[PDB]
Amino acid sequence: QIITTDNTFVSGNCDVVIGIVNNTVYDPLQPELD
Amino acid sequence: QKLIANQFNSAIGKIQDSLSSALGKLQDVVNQNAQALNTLVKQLSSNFGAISSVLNDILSRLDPPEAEVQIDRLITGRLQSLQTYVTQQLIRAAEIRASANLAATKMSECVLGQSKRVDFCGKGYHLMSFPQSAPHGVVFLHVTYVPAQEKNFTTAPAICHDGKAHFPREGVFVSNGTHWFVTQRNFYEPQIITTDNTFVSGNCDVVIGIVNNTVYDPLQPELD
Amino acid sequence: ILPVSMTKTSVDCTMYICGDSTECSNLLLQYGSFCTQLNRALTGIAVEQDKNTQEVFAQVKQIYKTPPIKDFGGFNFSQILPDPSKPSKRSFIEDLLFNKVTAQKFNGLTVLPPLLTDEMIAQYTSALLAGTITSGWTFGAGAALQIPFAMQMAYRFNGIGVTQNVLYENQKLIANQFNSAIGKIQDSLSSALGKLQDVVNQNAQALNTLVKQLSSNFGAISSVLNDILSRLDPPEAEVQIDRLITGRLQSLQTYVTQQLIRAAEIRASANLAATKMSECVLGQSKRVDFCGKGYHLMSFPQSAPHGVVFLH
Amino acid sequence: NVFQTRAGCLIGAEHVNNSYECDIPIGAGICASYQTSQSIIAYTMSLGAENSVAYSNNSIAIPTNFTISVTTE
């Protein structure tokens, strides 16, 4: 499934993690509010 | 909370009445060990084919070369009796050892912690436990939740809405006969079907039993 | 496969050591308590066999029964449910087990019947089955609560961390894999039960050894004490009989000591079976490899002579 | 009274067609108990009350209330 703000949760800036990849998170509830 | 506290306080009172009205598992260990000892003492007065069961008496009535072949029989018979007692005590110690290893496991998993292991910490779903000491043993008071009064309902695997199939996140779909609700599956507490209560997967064709209904979508009025 | 019990055996210590001989009987009294100790040990082993069997099978209060309509969402249990078509109301797999596993009331040896008959034990395995397939785990924790079988299966899937839509989207496939897998058990068994069979072999070997020890002389002039009494006068007959008493005592002591050690093995196996019944038949276990290999979904009990079979 | 069983021949107990929980075990499925005048009776034990569960392809039972129980081991 696509990466979304309800598939995921945040914690801190990206560099705190030893291994991380850049990608987009779609944020679907924003389109639903729109 | 007040109901649950009253049920708990009431349940402890029943334990006290039951014990003041049994401990057979402990008592019969004490009885078995007394029987073995009294049997050891009784074996002393047996003759084993000797002229008397008393060594001083044999020595009073026989000279040494005749006395010794009588005394060798009492030694043989008493050794045989002790070999029997020590063997049976070793076998009993293995049972008590297995029971103590079980009790140390219940202390670890029922008194510390909470256990998912069905019927390990008493019948029903385990809440917690308390130890109490007993002579040569231990008593666990196991506190358990038991689901009580219950109602029949109609139910469906999934809900079909905009051609999407919806499944409950954390509950089960139920109907009072006219309306559909989602509820937690150990305690009846109904709620309307929502996108916060559900997740979609695929279209309505594949699910064997599936019922048409509305999913609420809670931000839709808030567009106003 | 687990052993649960062994044949309740009792031996009259006097009847084994002595025939009709009052002479032998009167000499045996000089050894005091040994025959009382040997009877207490063997009756202790005997009552434990019924307790082992109760603790495995008597988990349930109600005798649950399946509906007339076997509509379990495509899953088929006919191999494992009872046959009403026959006097012995075992399931097809239970008959197949009972036929596969393959009287000596002589020198004071006796065999006591078990408390629950084989038909009552098969009625408990049927109760455990019917409650499991119509209510999932709930009949262990309290009342049986009905639920449709495809939903009880959706919860077993969540219990192993797979989302429930994976079941409903694949229900026919999963039912076919299940129905197919049950068939292979029937082939595997009809085509072994060594765990149960060797408990039977071990007890028969021990009893035949007790009977063979009767014909040994133990250094006496004969192994028949009527022959001794016929050919000798009392002061010589008694020491020859005292040899036979000594050898026959050592023979029972050996047999009972070995039987106590074997009883402790079967007791450990029965407590394991009662735990597997509790955690694998009722409930669903997180304990890796406890309820068979892979992730546990559910299990079914089947009765067997002196044992239990779990289909995990 | 005289009665004959897989467990042996039993004397001084009355055999009945009823079934109850096992009070004193005799063997091979038979139990004995003191019952009504008051007498020793011998009988085939019952394993429990039957319950045909109300199964259907769309029916479920939900608990509406709970009990807390304390139990002794």
From Swiss-Prot, chain A:
Domain of life: Viruses
Glycosylation sites: N22
Function as written in the Swiss-Prot or TrEMBL entry: Subunit of the fusion protein that is processed upon entry into the host cell. Mediates fusion of the virion and cellular membranes by functioning as a class I viral fusion protein. Contains a viral fusion peptide that is unmasked after S2 cleavage. This cleavage can occur at the cell membrane by host TMPRSS2 or during endocytosis by host CSTL. In either case, this triggers an extensive and irreversible conformational change that leads to fusion of the viral envelope with the cellular cytoplasmic membrane, releasing viral genomic RNA into the host cell cytoplasm.
Full protein name: Spike protein S2'
Boundaries of the shown chain within the full protein: 1113 to 1146 of 1273
